[PDB]
Amino acid sequence: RISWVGEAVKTDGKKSYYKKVCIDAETLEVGDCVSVIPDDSSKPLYLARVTALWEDSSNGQMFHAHWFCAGTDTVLGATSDPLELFLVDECEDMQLSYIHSKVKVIYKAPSENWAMEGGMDPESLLEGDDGKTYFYQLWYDQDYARFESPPKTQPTEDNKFKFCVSCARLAEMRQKEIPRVLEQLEDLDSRVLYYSATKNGILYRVGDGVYLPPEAFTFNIKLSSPVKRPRKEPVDEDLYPEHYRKYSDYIKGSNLDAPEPYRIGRIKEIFCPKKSNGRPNETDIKIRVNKFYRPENTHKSTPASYHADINLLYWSDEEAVVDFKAVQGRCTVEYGEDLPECVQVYSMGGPNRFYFLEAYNAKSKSFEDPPNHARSKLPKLRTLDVFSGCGGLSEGFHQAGISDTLWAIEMWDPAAQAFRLNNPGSTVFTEDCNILLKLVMAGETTNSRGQRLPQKGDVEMLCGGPPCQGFSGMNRFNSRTYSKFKNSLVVSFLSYCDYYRPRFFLLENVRNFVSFKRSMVLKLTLRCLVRMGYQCTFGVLQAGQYGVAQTRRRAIILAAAPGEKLPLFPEPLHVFAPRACQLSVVVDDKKFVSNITRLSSGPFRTITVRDTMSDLPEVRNGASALEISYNGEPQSWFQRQLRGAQYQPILRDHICKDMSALVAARMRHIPLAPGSDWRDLPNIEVRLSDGTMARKLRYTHHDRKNGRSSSGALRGVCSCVEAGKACDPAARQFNTLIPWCLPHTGNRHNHWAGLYGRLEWDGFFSTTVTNPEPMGKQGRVLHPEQHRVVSVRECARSQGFPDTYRLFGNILDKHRQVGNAVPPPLAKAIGLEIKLCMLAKA
DNA sequence: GAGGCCGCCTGC
DNA sequence: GCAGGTGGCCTC
Ligand SMILES: CCc1c(C#N)c(N[C@@H](C(N)=O)c2ccccc2)nc(N2CCC(N)CC2)c1C#N
Ligand SMILES: [Zn+2]
Ligand SMILES: [Zn+2]
């Protein structure tokens, strides 16, 4: 019934390989595709490709199945094409009995004219199917949700009869994960030295720089005891009646939980212990390294980092031995004097670059000079930026050196004007993108302004962030919301991508984009991208991990054309508060992460509010002078970078909103200590700037949940403080220094923590919003010491904008332009990944 | 124009 | 329960 067709080709031990088999009425040769029924009868058929056929000594006939992945098993779920399969690195040996039937699976390769095949309608993009047999076009990575072009691994001249792509690639992954040694250097009594070693595809030689976890070694200087903050001191509960609402010790924006950055070492020795027979134990690789001091690691504490370059180190003669498996990555450490270029050009010339000019003696606590032995382009893509705003994303991409934004679409006129100011020679369209795309498809060459429309082949990269108004909820779809989505700017942006078919595609959005409508917006976006034939992936990034003193999580969808390489998500550059670095995404109870491996530490210290704005001169509430003096040189590395090389005699847009007299008094009465907000306000009468009076807040009702103060005073301010009682209007009090609504509804709003809250110099900004309001949702917008809200310039600094970047309109317009923009450092990290792909193209 | 006021859901 | 994520709309 089942037997071989022919004679043997290789009798290896207990198995005998054959090239073709016969089962019942059909024949199977290697390369065909088969189905296997799972143990649960209702589950769909498993599909695989047969890569080897043999017979076992004690089991029977066997074959090797390289499994396909059903489209619904991927992140696309039910949105997938019901007959589309994906290549995966899943395979196993299986008894030939399990084979159910032979199936026809074809590879739909993109044509040589793929870039001109776009133009299908949103209905086809969202829901259209191939309407053919089983087909596959992309290889799928299930842990990172990555769709990429199928790998081109070639067989051998001796292992082609039993060749499995999955087996070969898994062997490659294991071998690269193995840390190995290389060319031997010397044989000592105790160990064997080597010149080079390999780990995760990275080569480490003697003298190279190594990242190490902060726990790898300690410094000879003592970590002198910091005075731990005592418990909450008793306060005058009558003078500060709302202080009791601060019973939690969690401070928003604090960096006390931020992890330490990497230890930096220089490889002095690579060695392995010797077995008693003299042969080295190459499974136990050790490295002896020389210690580098960050400035904050010297006897001078954290303050030494305020002015120093973020990549400046001090050589030391201290040494430490660590396991080779503890190395987190390779880095370059150079003595600055013998450098073929200036230190700034070096620092900007590549990743993981550090320099040292002096040495540090921990015992002496002085800076001597290092010893003698311490010594030793592509064309830019023409880019279309849809929903550009003032141009933060385009600016970051340009800083990465990958793009010339030749066309921009921005419907809001002040932001369009700002983009024009910063990008002369770029065509900015203020029309509806649907109107522009319809004109292009109709065959127009110019819009009603005479501006030349981009055509197929002009757009080499497409980037943008589309708003998601009308379907920004977490609840499941219905007919109305789904119609609103398929008529939305997200779908319009996808249509732009389908029509122009650029080499690279970037969709940026708020974090919750990955979860909208039960992750259905994300699933449909990925489905459209796959339908076009694009390689694609998604992830969540924290902007603070790339050089800004701001927590800003954003959703990123990346797509690469066939024949290109799919970019990786950038590894974090700066350590950041872990609470703000939760980047995993749950889709259909499956947890997806990005390729990022830097979870515990990073190469650079976190950027703080001090780094962000310590150099800006003091201004008053309602400051309106558009052009003032810096009154001094930049103080931090961040300030030097954002001020730039050319001297800037004028500071621009250091202006703040003119808050009312009551709000100004409230801000003036917010304490300067970290974590201070409205709950620290004193309950006093104060005469305002306009001659009017701000009155005491009278506590008129009893809060059984919150109780009474130390003086027996009540804590409720309205009848609603009772169980079922409704708000009596007569209980509403006006013009109180402590705003009435905050204690009115504080019990169900986490006591409105952060409203009228001051920033912390050692801390970071909360998400920079379009309009700073102390009593809004994001109310922690007060200056650390000045009695005002943050300025436009301070918001731009929090976003990482260069000081020369031009804004347009009134102060609210400029605030909105800053708030709506992608931070240029984040954009630049993404662009650097894109450049890696550009340089690595086959 | 600006200021007061403040529901609903999710992840842990 | 705690923390985070979303402005908008009444009313003057
Ligand atoms: C925490 C501050 C707040 C916000 C905010 N940011 C809010 N934004 C929503 C709204 N404005 O509809 C909303 C707008 C657009 C998209 C999604 C949601 N709504 C609040 N609600 C509910 C409605 C309101 N009528 C009473 C209080 C509160 C509070 N507290
Ligand atoms: Zn295999
Ligand atoms: Zn009430």
Q: For the residues of A444-468, what is the DSSP string, one character each?
A: -SB-TT-PBPP-TTT-SEEEE----
In whole angstroms, what is the distance from residue A701 CA to residue A706 CA?
A: 11
How many angstroms separate the CA of A748 from the C1' of C10?
Answer: 22
Bridge partner residues of A707 (DSSP): A703
Residue nearest ligand 1's atom 8 by CA: A777
Radius of gyration of chain A (CA): 32
Residue A563 CB neighbours (<10 A): 14
Active site residue A468: yes
Give the whole-angstrom CA distance, residue A4 versus residue A54. 9
Rounded distance from Cα A822 to ligand 1 centre (Å): 23
Q: Which two tokens stand for residue A551?
A: 């927590």
CA distances from residue A75 to A145, A512, A516, A533, A590 in whole angstroms, order as listed: 7, 16, 14, 16, 8
- What is the distance between the alpha carbons of residues A815 and A655, in angstroms, rounded to a whole number? 10
* CB-strand contact A754/C, under 7 Å: yes
A536 pairs with which residues across the strands? A147, A559
Amino acid at A796: A
Centre of ligand 1 from the C-alpha of residue A777, in Å: 8
A572 DSSP 8-state letter: P
Length of chain A: 842
**Which among A450, A463, A568, A546 is positioned nearest to A824, based on CA atoms?**
A546
The one-letter amino acid at A754: G
In this complex, the residue with its CA at the shortest distance from the C1' of nucleotide C5 is: A512
Counting from 1 in the atom list of ligand 1, the atom nearest the Cα of A473 is 17
Residues 769-798 of A with CB under 7 A from strand C: 769, 773, 776-777
Close Cβ partners of A449 (under 8 Å, ≥ 6 residues apart): none
Contact (Cβ atoms closer than 8 angstroms) between residue A94 and residue A66: no
Q: Which nucleotides of C are covered by protein (CB under 7 A)?
A: 2-8
Q: What is the 3-state secondary structure (H, E, C) of A511-542?
A: HHHHCHHHHHHHHHHHHHHHHHCCEEEEEEEE
Task: Yes or no: say if A788 and A774 are a contact pair by the CB < 8 Å rule.
Answer: no
What's the reported resolution, in angstroms, to a tenth? 2.5
Residue of the nearest CA to atom 5 in ligand 1? A777
Which nucleotide is nearest, taking the CA of residue A515 and each C1'?
A: B10
Q: State both tokens at A356.
A: 């040292």
Residue A284: which of A418, A135, A385, A181 has the closest Cα?
A181
Can you read off the two tokens belonging to residue A382?
A: 């023409």
Per annotation, catalytic residue among A33, A331, A463, A468: A468
Closest CA to A158 of A17, A354, A295, A36: A17
d(CA A649, CA A651): 7
The helix-helix angle for A413-422 and A811-820 (nearest 10°) equals: 70
3-state helix, strand, coil in chain A (%, to 5): 25, 25, 50
Q: What is the CATH number of the domain that holds A455?
A: 3.40.50.150
List bases in chain B with any atom under 7 Å of a protein Cβ: 2-12
Q: Distance between CA atoms of A556 and A831, rounded to whole angstroms? A: 12
CA-based torsion, A516, A522, A523, A527: positive or negative: positive
- A93 in Cβ contact with A61 (< 8 Å): no
CB A661, CB A689: distance < 8 Å:
yes
Q: Is any atom of nucleic acid chain C found less than 7 Å from the CB of residue A553? A: yes
H or E element at residue A405: strand A403-409
Distance, CA of A776 to C1' of C9, in Å: 13
The closest nt to A776, taking CA to C1', is C7
Bridge partners, residue A461, by sequence: A383, A504
In 3-state terms, what secondary structure has residue A218? coil
Half-sphere exposure of A660 (CA within 13 A, CB side): 10
User: For A775 and C12, how far is CA from C1' in angstroms?
Assistant: 18
Paired tokens of A20: 């073709």
Which residues 476-535 of chain A have a CB under 7 Å from nucleic chain C?
Answer: 510-512
**Distance from C-alpha of A831 to C-alpha of A114, rounded to nearest angstrom:** 24
Residue spans of beta strands (DSSP E) within A39-83: 46-56, 61-70
Q: Give the C-alpha separation, A234 to A791, whole Å.
A: 35
Q: Which atom of ligand 1 is nearest to the CA of A745?
A: 30
Rounded to the nearest 10 degrees, the angle between the axes of helix A516-532 and helix A489-500 is 10
Ligand 1 neighbourhood includes A474 CB (under 6 angstroms): no
Q: A392-399 vs A824-839: helix axis angle to the nearest 10?
A: 50
The string of DSSP letters for A234-275 reads ---TTTSTTGGGG-----TT--TTPPP--EEEEEEEEEEEBP
DSSP β-ladder status, A105-107 and A461-464: unpaired
Burial of A87 (0-12, 13-18, 19+ CB in 10 A): buried
A79's tokens: 């949105």
CB neighbours (10 Å) of residue A774? 23
Closest to A529 (Cα-Cα) out of A569, A564, A571, A557: A557
Which of A773, A777, A778, A780 to mutate to test ligand 1, by most ligand atoms within 8 A of the CB atom? Answer: A777
Distance of CA A729 from the midpoint of ligand 3 (Å): 8
Please answer whether residues A592 and A563 qualify as being in contact, where contact means their C-beta atoms are separated by less than 8 angstroms. no
Q: Name the helix (H) or strand (E) containing A831.
A: helix A824-839
Contact call for residues A429 and A385 (beta carbons, < 8 A): no
- Rounded to an integer, what distance in angstroms lies between the CA atom of residue A395 and that of residue A835? 15
Ligand whose nearest atom lies closest to the CA of A775:
1
A207: left (phi over 0), alpha (psi -120 to 50) or beta: left
Distance (Å) from CA A820 to C1' B1? 22
Question: CA A336, CA A616: separation in Å to the nearest integer?
Answer: 30
- Please tell me the distance from the alpha carbon of residue A70 to that of residue A380, in angstroms, as a whole number: 38
CB neighbours of residue A372 within 10 Å: 6
A159 phi/psi in degrees, rounded to 5: -125, 40
In sign, the C-alpha dihedral spanning A557, A558, A562, A565 is negative
Q: Which residues contact A41 (CB under 8 A, 6 or more apart)?
A: none
Q: Of all protein residues, which has its CA closest to the C1' atom of C8?
A: A776
Residue A431 sits in which domain range?
381-608+825-840
- Alpha-carbon distance A111 to A321, whole Å? 55
Report helix angle A489-500 to A479-486, nearest 10. Answer: 40
Q: What is the 3-state secondary structure (H, E, C) of A633-692?
A: CCCCHHHHHHHCCCCCCCEECCCCCCCCHHHHHHHHCCCCCCCCCHHHCCCCCEECCCCC
CA(A491)–C1'(C6) in Å? 22
- C-alpha pair distances (Å), A577 with each of A250, A546, A549, A555, A783: 13, 13, 11, 19, 21
What sign does the CA torsion over A434, A439, A441, A446 have?
Answer: negative
Ligand 1 centre distance from Cα of residue A636 (Å): 38
Please tell me the number of the ligand nearest to residue A65's CA.
2
Q: Which atom of ligand 1 is nearest to the CA of A749?
A: 30
Dist. CA A575–CA A601, nearest whole Å = 6
**Ligand 1 touching residue A777 (CB < 6 A):** yes
Alpha-carbon dihedral A795, A798, A802, A807, rounded to 10 degrees: -20
Ligand 1 centre to CA of A817 (Å) is 22
Locate tokens 């002369």: which residue?
Answer: A424
Tokens 């301070």 belong to A794
**Ligand 1 centroid – CA A665 distance (Å):** 27
- Kindly report the protein residue whose alpha carbon is nearest to atom 1 of ligand 1: A777
CA A662 to chain centre: 40
Name all protein residues with C-beta less than 7 A from any atom of nucleic acid chain B: A 474-475, 515, 582, 584, 586, 657-660, 662-663, 727, 732, 734, 739-741, 744-745, 748-749, 773, 775-777, 812
Element (H, E) at A122: helix A122-127
Token pair, residue A397, equals 């991409």
Span from the CA of A589 to the centroid of ligand 2 (angstroms): 28
Question: Which protein residue has its CA closest to C1' of B8?
Answer: A473
Look at residues A135, A128, A87 and name the one whose alpha carbon lies nearest to residue A110: A135
Tokens of A687: 């005469």
How many angstroms from the chain centroid is the CA of residue A74? 22
Which strand (E) or helix (H) includes residue A429?
strand A427-429
Per the CB < 8 A criterion, the answer to whether A604 and A573 are in contact is: yes
C-alpha–C-alpha distance, residues A549 and A606, integer Å: 7
Give CA–CA dist A142/A593, Å, rounded: 10
SS3 assignment, position A774: coil
Within 8 A by CB and 6+ apart from A646, the residues are none
Per-residue buried b or exposed e for A44-81, using 16+ beta carbons within 10 Å of the residue's own CB: eebbbbbbbbbbeeeeebbbbbbbbbbbebbbbbebbb
Token digits of residue A346? 């070096």
* A80, A125, A136 from A533: Cα distances, Å: 13, 11, 11
| DSSP codes joined into one string, A687-726 | E-TTS-EEB-----B-BTTTB--TT----B-SGGGSSS--
Residue pointed to by tokens 């990073």: A602
d(CA A209, CA A225): 30
Beta strand pairing call for A535-542 and A504-510: unpaired
Q: Could you say which residues 572-591 of protein chain A have a Cβ atom less than 7 A away from any atom in strand C?
A: 579-580
Bridge partners (DSSP) of residue A95 are A62
Q: How many CB atoms lie within 10 A of CB A209?
A: 22
- Which helix (H) or strand (E) is A418 found in, with range? helix A413-422
Residue A736 pairs with which residues in a beta bridge? A695
| Other CB atoms within 10 A of residue A352 CB | 17
d(CA A485, CA A470): 8
Contacts of residue A600, defined as CB under 8 A and 6 or more positions apart, other chains included, come to A213, A259
Query: To 10 degrees, the CA torsion angle through A742, A744, A748, A749?
Result: -10
Please give the annotated binding residues of A for S-adenosyl-L-methionine, written as ranges.
388, 392-393, 410-411, 432-433, 820, 822
Signed CA dihedral, A356, A359, A360, A365: sign only:
negative
At residue A302, φ and ψ (nearest 5 deg) are -35, -40
Closest nucleotide to the alpha carbon of A249, via C1': C2
- Tell me if A768 sits within 8 A of A259, measured CB to CB: no
Q: After which residues, if any, is chain A broken (C to N > 2.5 Å)?
A: 376
For strand C, which residues in window 249-308 of chain A come within 7 Å by CB?
Answer: 250, 252
CA distance A333 to A322: 19
Contact A776 CB / ligand 1 (< 6 Å): no
Measured CA A307 to C1' B12 distance, in angstroms:
38
Taking CA atoms, A39 is separated from A45, A69, A82, A214, A829, in Å, by 10, 17, 22, 49, 47
Distances (CA, A) of A248 to A252, A521, A765: 11, 37, 20
Nucleotide nearest to A584 (CA to C1'): B11
Helix (H, G, I), strand (E, B) or coil at A813: helix
**Å from A808 (CA) to B4 (C1')?**
29
